[PDB]
């Protein structure tokens, strides 16, 4: 089969600027017989560009492909907030169809410092027998953050997950939630709960915390 | 006005089988082939099938082979995919798409439907739990956990979709225990709270779960 292979992995550029992504085959074929697809999450692919660079239905003339053999290009002229997406290349000149793995292009905008706050496990969830501790840290960018967590100054390893958004649709940021689960005995015999967070757009780590039944 | 819609996904138990869907409208469907593409939670897509105009011709990935028939209806307009032996690695959102010439694999998919996701797997049903994450004692932070349930998905809003402004639904988590959970937050005006009503709204079709969540200081 061909193989393609999509380079970088994950782009970040500018609104206004150019993108410049990159789809590498493993046997050289023909540029009639490449297409590019654009998904947005919680969304089907769809049709960007192809064979080699004519335009779907609704596609901007600032989307232009280029490049024969086993290089192809996907050239993205000032870069609109919608053009942010994950961008797949595929050819069907040969059995069988195949994809590039997708090059997933990400908005970049100002450093800024996310807002933290911590909320404890509700009576309800403590009624229903288990306890999870949450910390939120909202709209931040980038996305590099690390969240500690400790209960009565034990620092808590292995214990907690997180889930980060996808980019907001205004202001280009990201928001976090880190989940600490501990039993409800263990919740109930200790005392501090906090969530101590480090990032680029803070001086210094930001620590929000509570202490239960205070 | 092309529509392409599936239907028939699902949880199913590994060995199991499923019939997919896809109603179509808005072209003549009897010209055109027809393809299934699939992608695995968090993975690249991948073609999985693909099947002539009139159905003499019909095309695998190697993968599928034997497990999987692709076939049409012309006169019903729908794409279908029977899925039997099913695998954990055949857990996907299956996309039915519309090919542009009536040759199977070997054109640009110029229409695609939203999916329909296969969740192939051992594990019950199970609906979650909804509890509060109440704003603390000028902008506050609250929301809503949506613990313990299988399988994907769960949808939140908030205040029946009257509030938008300063959402956050977090993609759900894969608990240790193999069930998810996922937080929605919102942040909002201080000298609201208490005064202002906020309600998230949580549905879990999967085991018919719905409900509203008051959440207050
Ligand atoms: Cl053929
Ligand atoms: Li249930
Ligand atoms: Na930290």
């Known amino acids: 089969e061909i193989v393609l292979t999509q380079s970088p992995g994950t782009l970040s550029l500018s609104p206004g600027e150019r993108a410049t992504l990159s789809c590498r085959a493993s046997?050289?074929?023909?540029?009639?017989?490449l297409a590019w697809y654009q998904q947005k999450p919680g969304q089907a692919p769809r049709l960007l560009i192809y064979?080699?660079?004519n335009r779907a239905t609704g596609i901007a003339d600032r989307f232009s492909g280029s490049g024969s053999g086993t290089d192809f290009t996907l050239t993205i002229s000032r870069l609109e907030p919608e053009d942010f997406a994950v961008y797949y290349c595929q050819q069907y000149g040969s059995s069988p169809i195949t994809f590039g793995q997708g090059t997933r292009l990400e908005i970049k905008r100002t450093v800024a410092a996310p807002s933290v706050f911590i909320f404890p496990p509700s009576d309800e969830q403590l009624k229903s027998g288990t306890a999870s501790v949450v910390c939120l840290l909202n709209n931040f960018y980038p996305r590099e953050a690390k969240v500690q967590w400790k209960v009565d100054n034990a620092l808590q390893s292995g214990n907690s997950q997180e889930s980060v958004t996808e980019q907001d649709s205004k202001d280009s940021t990201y928001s976090l939630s880190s989940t600490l689960t501990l039993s409800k005995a263990d919740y109930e015999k200790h005392k501090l709960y906090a969530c101590e967070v480090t990032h680029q757009g803070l001086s210094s780590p930001v620590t929000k915390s509570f202490n239960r039944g205070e | 006005q092309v529509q392409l819609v599936e239907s028939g996904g699902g949880l199913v138990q590994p060995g199991g089988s499923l019939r997919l869907s896809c109603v179509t409208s808005g072209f003549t469907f009897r010209s055109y082939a027809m393809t299934w593409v699939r992608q695995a939670p968090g993975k690249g897509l991948e073609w999985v099938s693909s099947i002539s105009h009139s159905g003499g011709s019909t095309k695998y990935a190697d993968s599928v082979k034997g497990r999987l028939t692709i076939s049409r209806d012309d006169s019903m307009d729908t794409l279908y995919l029977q899925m039997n032996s099913l695998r954990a690695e055949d857990t996907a959102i299956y996309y039915c798409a519309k090919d542009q010439i009536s040759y199977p694999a070997a054109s640009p998919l110029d229409y695609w439907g939203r999916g329909t996701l296969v969740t192939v797997s051992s594990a019950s049903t199970k609906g979650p739990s909804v509890f509060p994450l109440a704003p603390s004692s000028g902008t506050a932070a609250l929301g809503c956990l949506v613990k313990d349930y299988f399988p994907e998905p769960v949808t939140v809003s908030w205040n029946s979709g009257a509030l938008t402004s300063g959402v956050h639904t977090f993609p759900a988590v894969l608990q240790s225990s193999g069930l998810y959970s996922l937080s929605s937050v919102v942040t909002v005006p201080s000298s609201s709270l208490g005064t202002q009503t906020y309600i998230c709204n949580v549905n879990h079709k999967p085991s018919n779960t719905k409900v509203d969540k008051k959440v207050e200081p």
């Open positions: 064979a080699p660079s």
């Open positions: 046997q050289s074929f023909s540029s009639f017989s």
